[PDB]
């Protein structure tokens, strides 16, 4: 008369997640705050 | 007669969970505060 | 009448957590306060 | 009549965690204060 | 009628932890205060 | 009979040049590559 | 009978020229790539 | 019968020039690559 | 009959130039590759 | 019938320089690799 019972308030079974973050607040181009030439 | 009772409040079988962060916060290429050339 | 109770408040079997972080705030590439030529 | 009980708050099995920083908060690259030439 | 009883609070069984940290706060590259050439 | 003459290519009097750059590229707040929180 | 000649390609007199740069490319509030939560 | 002559390619009088960069390319604020807090 | 020649290719008088770099590509505030807590 | 010649390729009077630079590529601040805490 088995209860053969499973209770587990969270059971995951084979769960793949990826969190991939690239580039966030970054600067791969130029930033420049002036650029002044040519000024007589 | 066996309960046979699993009683877990998590269970995780085989969860594979990546994080990955490439670059946050970062300079690949020119950041310059002035560029001055030719003042007279 | 085994009881055959498991009872764990955590179970984790099989679990891969991978933590990547590549170049947060750092640099790679130039940056100068201030370049300055040719200034008469 | 076993128990057969197995009670741990916490159980881990078969867990790899990796966690890689790579170059946080690092220069490969120029930094320059200031760059003067050509002053007259 | 045995209890076959295992109670530990904390069980880990075959877990790698890798930490890596590669060049956090590290100079690979110039830095330089200023750079001053060509001034009369 | 005085030439009086002054021949100059450039003539510069009282000039003054203020280049002024702030917060070029920079940072004064959170950059997060990511925030994970409350992952079962 | 004096020439009194005054010959200059450019003549500046007087002249005050402020460049004033403040936050370019810059971050003073949270840029953050991702936030998750309550992920079950 | 002077010449009185003045010949310069370049004249410069009382030429005040400040170049200020401030927070070029800086962190002043948090910049993090990963927070994961609560993972089961 | 004097010349009274002045023939200089550059002439300076009271020039005065303040190269100010502040905190250029540097830290006041957190880098942390990663954060990670209450991972079970 | 003086030649009262003046012939400087540069001539220079009263010239002040000031370079300055503050906190290029340093840390006043935290820079971590890794925080990890609470891993079971």
Do not use: P, T
């Not at 209860?3 to 793949?16: A, M, N, P």
């Amino acid at each position: 008369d088995a209860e053969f019972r499973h209770d587990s308030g969270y059971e995951v079974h084979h769960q793949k997640l990826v969190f991939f973050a690239e580039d966030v607040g970054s600067n791969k181009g130029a930033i420049i705050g002036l650029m002044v030439g040519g000024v007589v």
